[PDB]
Design a protein around this ligand. Structure first.
Ligand SMILES: O=C(N[C@H](CO)[C@H](O)c1ccc([N+](=O)[O-])cc1)C(Cl)Cl
Ligand SMILES: O=C(N[C@H](CO)[C@H](O)c1ccc([N+](=O)[O-])cc1)C(Cl)Cl
Length: 160
């Protein structure tokens, strides 16, 4: 069914990926420093600052995007910017990309651990990470775009 492949993100993918977040909450979950409306320029700025920007493809469509927020050779990487096409939610795209990013963290960065953090309102992300073997380690206070306090739940998982 949902055959998925991956490759590094390319300039040609920017518009498509920038179309993924459907509301301010979704943008905040994936890219908390971004400002709504999202734009190719904001996506390109993240890609420049980060590593490992990767897309997931199915039936000739880019359906997902992720990168590393943090990377420390021999130590850990932290997942960032997970976005999924609105017509492909709940089909395994985020799960698939997390596995790809785990492999890349192991292979390229010799990471022993992957970190995933999710904002408290992002139930789906918390639950998916839990399904994939991530455990919560800490909770940090953050603020949303309206200045309201939110909880960032910081999870991790050993790699192999
Ligand atoms: O789909 C969600 N969260 C997933 C969990 O894997 C992920 O955090 C995500 C965030 C933003 C997004 N987007 O804006 O396209 C897509 C997936 C919630 Cl918005 Cl319901
Ligand atoms: O700054 C630029 N490129 C960098 C890489 O050198 C990166 O691609 C980027 C693009 C857009 C951007 N932005 O508009 O915020 C920031 C960085 C060009 Cl606009 Cl000159």
């Amino acid at each position: 069914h949902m055959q998925l492949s991956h490759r590094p993100a390319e300039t040609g993918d920017l518009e498509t990926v920038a179309g993924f977040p459907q509301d301010r909450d979704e943008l905040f979950y994936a890219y908390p420093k971004a400002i709504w409306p999202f734009s190719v320029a904001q996506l390109a700025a993240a890609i420049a600052e980060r590593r490992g920007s990767t897309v997931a493809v199915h039936d000739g469509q880019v359906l997902g995007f992720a990168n590393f927020y943090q990377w420390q050779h021999g130590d850990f990487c932290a997942l960032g910017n997970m976005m999924v096409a609105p017509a492909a939610r709940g089909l395994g795209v985020a799960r698939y990309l997390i596995g790809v990013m785990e492999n890349l963290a192991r292979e390229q960065y010799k990471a022993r651990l992957m970190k995933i953090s999710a904002f408290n309102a992002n139930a789906a992300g918390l639950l998916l990470a839990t399904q994939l073997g991530y455990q919560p380690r800490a909770i940090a206070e953050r603020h949303d775009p309206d200045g309201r306090r939110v909880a960032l739940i910081q999870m991790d998982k050993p790699l192999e």
